Structure formats: C-alpha cells, structure tokens
Automatic annotation (TrEMBL), chains A, B:
Its EC number is 2.3.3.16. This is Putative citrate synthase 2. The gene is citA. The keyword Transferase applies. GO terms for biological process: carbohydrate metabolic process; tricarboxylic acid cycle. InterPro entries: Citrate_synth-like_lrg_a-sub, Citrate_synth-like_sm_a-sub, Citrate_synthase, Citrate_synthase_AS, Citrate_synthase_sf. Belongs to the citrate synthase family. One of its GO terms (molecular function) is citrate synthase activity. The lineage of its organism: Bacteria, Bacillati, Actinomycetota, Actinomycetes, Mycobacteriales. It holds the Pfam family Citrate_synt.
Length: 368, 368
C-alpha cells in the first residue's frame, strides 16, 4: 500500500534552472519568459549560457574541426557513440576530480560538438564536407550548424531553428534529463552523462511525432477544405495528429511561440495549418465535450521544422540538439549538489530454495 | 521540509529478481544463494538465464563473429559505443514495438557481444585476433571470453572468473541498474539502455578500487610482516585499501565467496592476503572501537582477478561484464511493468524578470 510504481509525483531535487508553470501557462528560463527570448531574437548560444550560468555573461564557443567517425545509419546512434568517445581523446576526467569551471568548459565543448556531429550525419557520407572557411563566414552557433549541413544557409530558415531550439531547450525533469542527472551523480565524466541522456530521448515515449502531422497537412490544399478532411479522418476511426489532452492547464506556451514564429517568418503552410488547428479543435470539443483538449506542441513544431527544410527522419535529432542546453545546466547543478541518487526496491519474488528445486537443474547437470 | 535530496530510501519498484538481505548476511538470485551457485560451479551463462528468466530453462548463446569497430583507448568507451551501434545493423526496434520473447533474444545477443567486445579491446589492436576455430573449442561463455582474450585459457583461471562474475551479477537497485530501468521505461531499444547503464557504472562512486589493494599486498612478502606493514601505513596517515564501514550488517556475503574461491583454487596470494585481512581488521577495531569495520568486497576481488591475470586497468570492465546479467533482468522486468519513470522537482530560482535586468544583456545587444 501507499505505492505507485514509477516515482510519479515524488520530489527528487530542487532546481534554480527553469520553472514550468503548468497552471499559469508560462515557461521561464532563470525567470525570463521564452516568448521574450524568441521575439527579441536571442540565439541558441546565449540561451544555452543563460540556462547553464544563470546570466548572459559568456555564450557558446564554435565547434572545432572534427570529422564524425561514426556512420551507423541512425543520427541518434552516431551522436550517442561519438560523444562517449570524446573523453579519451580530449582527456576528460571524472566529475569528482575537476572543479566547477572546468566542467563548464567541458560541457560547452561537448555540446557544440554534438551539434556538429548531427549536421554531419544528416548531410550524409555520399557528399563532400562543407569547407571550414565557408562555415567560418557565420557568427552564431545556429548559423554554423545550418551551413555545415546545407551549404548555403537561408537566413529565414536559421531564424526558424533558433526559435525552435530556444523553446525546446529546457522543460523540467524529463526522463532524459533525469538520466543525465543520475549518471552525473555517480561522478562520471560529462561525456558519459550526455551520451546516456541521448539514449533516453531515443525512446518513443519521450514526446510526440512531429513528422506524423505533415501527411495530414499535405492532404489539405486550401483553408476551405480543412473541415472536410478533418471530417474524413475522424469518421474512418483514425486519430488526429497533433491534438490531445492538455499538457499545460490551458495550452503549452511552447506551441504559442512556435505558431507565432511561423506567422512572423511567413511560412507557406501557416494559412493551411491555422485552418486545420481550428477545425480539429472545434470537432474534438464537439464529439467529447468532457475532456480538456488542446493543440500539442508537436503540431506547430512540424510546421517550423518543415519550413526550415528539415526532413522527417531528422526531426527527432533537432529536438535533441536543443535540449543539450537543459542537459548541461542540470549536470552542472547535480555536480555542485554532490549526492548520489540511489533509490530502493522491495523484493516480492520467490523465497529461499535450493538449486535442485529450480526448473531446469537437470540441464545444468547433463551439460556441466 | 521533509526533503532529503537524492531519493534516499524511496521505494521506486518491486522486483522478483534478487533479494540482498542486509540484516541476515545473504544474497540470493531468485531465491538461490550465491554460495550454492559458486561452490557447485554453475557457469555465468546459466546464472544469467536464472536471473533473467527465473529458472534454468535456456542459458546464453555464444557470440557471433564481429570484430570490434571502436578503438578509443578506453575499454568502457569501446563497449558503451559499440553496444549502441548494434541497433541499426541488427534492426533492433523500440521496446514498445516488440513482445517479451523478442526482447529476451535481443538482450541475450547484446550481452554476449559486450563480453566479446571487452575481450577484444583488452587484447588490443597490436595483436592479431584469435582464430574463431580455437574459440569454438570451448563450450561455455566464460571460457570463450578467456580464449578470445588470452589465446590459451588456463582452466583454473576460468573458474576464478566464473566465481567472480556470478557474485557480481546482481545486487539490487544500484545507480547503473536504475539508469538501465529509466532508459527502458521510455520505450527505447535494449541496446540504448545497456549503453547508458555502462555510462553510469563508469562513475568512480559506483564501488571500490580493487587495483588499489594490489600495491599494498605487494609490499608484504610473508605472513609474518603483515602486522608491521599495516603498522606503517596507519602511522603515515594514509588509508588502508579494502577496509571500511560495513555494507552488510555483518560482512558482504560476496566477500565470503570470493575469499573461499581463492582458497579452493590455490591462489598464491591467499596466504599473504588472509594475514593482511586479520592484521588490518585487528588494528582498525583497536584504534576506533566505536565503528563497525568490515572487509570490503573489493579486497578479495583483487586477489581473484589478479590470480586470473587480469591487469589493473581491466578490473573495472570485468565488473561490468558480470553485471550485464542483472541489467538485462531489470530491463525485461521494466518492460512488463510498462510505466515511465518521471519524478518531480521544486523551483527555488529567481522569480519573473525581464531580459534587460539580467547581467550580460549588453553583450547580447552589442553582438546581435
């Protein structure tokens, strides 16, 4: 009794990093609203520094040249493995043996190299790399990532990614952030903790499937037939991509800034995407008025990411790129805390028995 | 108030896998004492199957040929990265999309390939690989590991590893086991969860340093001068390697079976190691009789591992090899549970402010 498996609602830490007000419909990084950051066009490197350091003192340095050595065919796997291999070649010591400033420099160096590995993996092995002198023509971390990936970077496409990365940078104690904090609490080096957090984010229960709303949006060709299409999908017993039970008590403020960014940047799908949003919401609240139904953040993430020419198989990696900022801030906070996380379990399995009583002992005898 | 950071003493799961009785000085895998397993010479592959399945039905299959592709200079890094890259090439789906029997087959295939990667990495790149036809002359997982690593396998050295691996296979909800369960609870593939657990085990707070007791044991050349040496180390203000506050209410039963195994196998250091054990214990209980002082399991682990010709830099990887059995059983149990672990945090950071109030806004202005 008094037991719900899964630590649901158990307080494990106190953080000073970010506060997601579920009741007030707000998300603030160190007290600053994400809407202020996105509208005022603050780039990812500065939001990374604000979350990790607590102010706008010193941003994010550019990535050094380092051709990706892993080509597994899965962008996630490439960066999970390539990050772990940074510790030997760069001489990363365990967190126990370094001071706070050294951990911050190591976290910044590994974060920006993750973005470089993602861009190289997405560009693919069947293409020559983009020369370093062209990459160096840009001055922001986000612009260099786009140049390294696509060659010529469309400036309006870069602003879409900076909007998306800033709104996905940090969102509390998600499972992949919890994993990074657990690995860091054992004293391991920063690369081992980042690498494990990527493994957690790879799980399909980490969020939504932005790529799945694009085929629906492709069926609707004008704002007028948005109601008719939503009629058909709901009548065929299928599900509506991008809508469900509310996560925030009203709406996710992250869906707000992504939609506003799509309008401000003049994304072609905006007109049709707004029409599908109101069509889907009017229907779902009509067929089942008992549930609080809202637009999920995955819906407007698909519009912003697709407008920036990000393919479907690459959309999960673009979320991981942004979340490195939250991961690094929690790793640095876990280091200063200095307390190993170590929960408990309760045994309910079989009582004491002899090996001969177990089924299969005969095989152990015949073989051994 | 009512808050101790780190989930200390919080119950997160109920397991049927193993019960470490801290008060009774016992460790049982599915109800079977580890002393019965070690003395009756039950090999690692069968203990792996007992922990994962719950009986001696079907053991562990041999590893397929697969030259290690990672050569980072750190055995841990090689296996952490090489495990994650198994998912694309072998077509591992997420845990959500497969049934229980398929996850068990995937876990067995990845476990035995971890052991093969450890053996290849330890043997090193400056040596030609051991032919597959020689490896196939052995019939157990533990013997093949030793053949792949050292060429000729000493049978008494193989029994030392089977004794050590069985006693290190599983020990409750350690941080690296907790990490594997958290990654698995997101629905990720089994290779991603094993890879992250290795990152947690790499942290120096995961256990002891077996390699550190060997230099002390090398100073003592006969049983007689063990008291004199322990006198010197304690008088120079240094620490005694392998002894400290008790973990089990009496002694770790794992230290029991390791010491008994060292005696039964006739390890040359046994005579001197027993003499140092009683010398160190008699002193520590004499200088501070207020503390319950016991022999740590790292002490007899060093004797067993060194007797099997395992170098110091390789001793951490030999612990990870054994713990794969506990990792796989908890991953399979977490899958059947079907509940994402997702704890909570409490914000205590700065309240709502405007971006211009933050220190460093001026830099953001001059640059942007």
């Amino acid at each position: 009794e008094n037991f719900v498996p899964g630590l649901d609602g158990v307080v494990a830490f106190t953080t000073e990093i970010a506060e997601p007000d579920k009741d007030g419909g707000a998300l603030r990084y160190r007290g600053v609203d994400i809407e202020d950051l996105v509208s005022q066009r603050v780039t990812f490197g500065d939001v990374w520094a604000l979350l990790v350091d607590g102010n706008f003192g010193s941003g994010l340095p550019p990535a050094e040249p380092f051709p990706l050595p892993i080509h597994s065919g899965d962008v996630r796997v490439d960066v999970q493995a390539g990050l772990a291999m940074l510790a030997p070649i760069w001489g990363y010591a365990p967190l126990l043996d370094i001071d706070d400033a050294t951990a911050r420099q190591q976290l910044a160096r590994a974060s920006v190299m993750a973005l470089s590995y993602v861009a190289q993996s997405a560009r693919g092995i069947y293409q020559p790399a983009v020369p370093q002198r062209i990459i160096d023509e840009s001055s922001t971390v986000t612009a260099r990532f786009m140049t390294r990936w696509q060659g010529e970077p469309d400036p309006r496409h870069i602003e879409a990614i900076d909007a998306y990365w800033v709104s996905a940078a940090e969102h509390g104690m998600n499972a992949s952030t919890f994993t990074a904090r657990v690995i860091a609490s054992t004293g391991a080096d920063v690369a081992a903790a980042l690498s494990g957090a990527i493994g957690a984010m790879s799980g399909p229960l980490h969020g939504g499937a932005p790529a799945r709303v694009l085929p629906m949006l492709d069926e609707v060709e004008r704002a007028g037939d948005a109601r008719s299409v939503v009629k058909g999908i709901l009548d065929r017993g299928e599900k509506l991509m991008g809508f469900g039970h509310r996560v925030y008590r009203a709406e996710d403020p992250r869906a707000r800034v992504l939609r506003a960014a799509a309008e401000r940047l003049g994304a072609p799908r905006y007109e049709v995407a707004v029409a599908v949003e109101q069509a889907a919401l009017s229907e779902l609240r009509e067929r089942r008025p008992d549930r609080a139904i809202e637009t999920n953040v995955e819906f407007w993430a698909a519009v912003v990411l697709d407008f920036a020419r990000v393919p479907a198989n690459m959309m999960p990696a673009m979320f991981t790129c942004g979340r490195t900022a939250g991961w690094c801030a929690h790793i640095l906070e876990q280091k200063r805390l200095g307390k190993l996380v170590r929960p408990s379990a309760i045994y309910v399995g079989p009582g004491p028995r002899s090996p001969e009583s177990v089924d299969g002992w005969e095989r152990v005898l015949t073989t051994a």
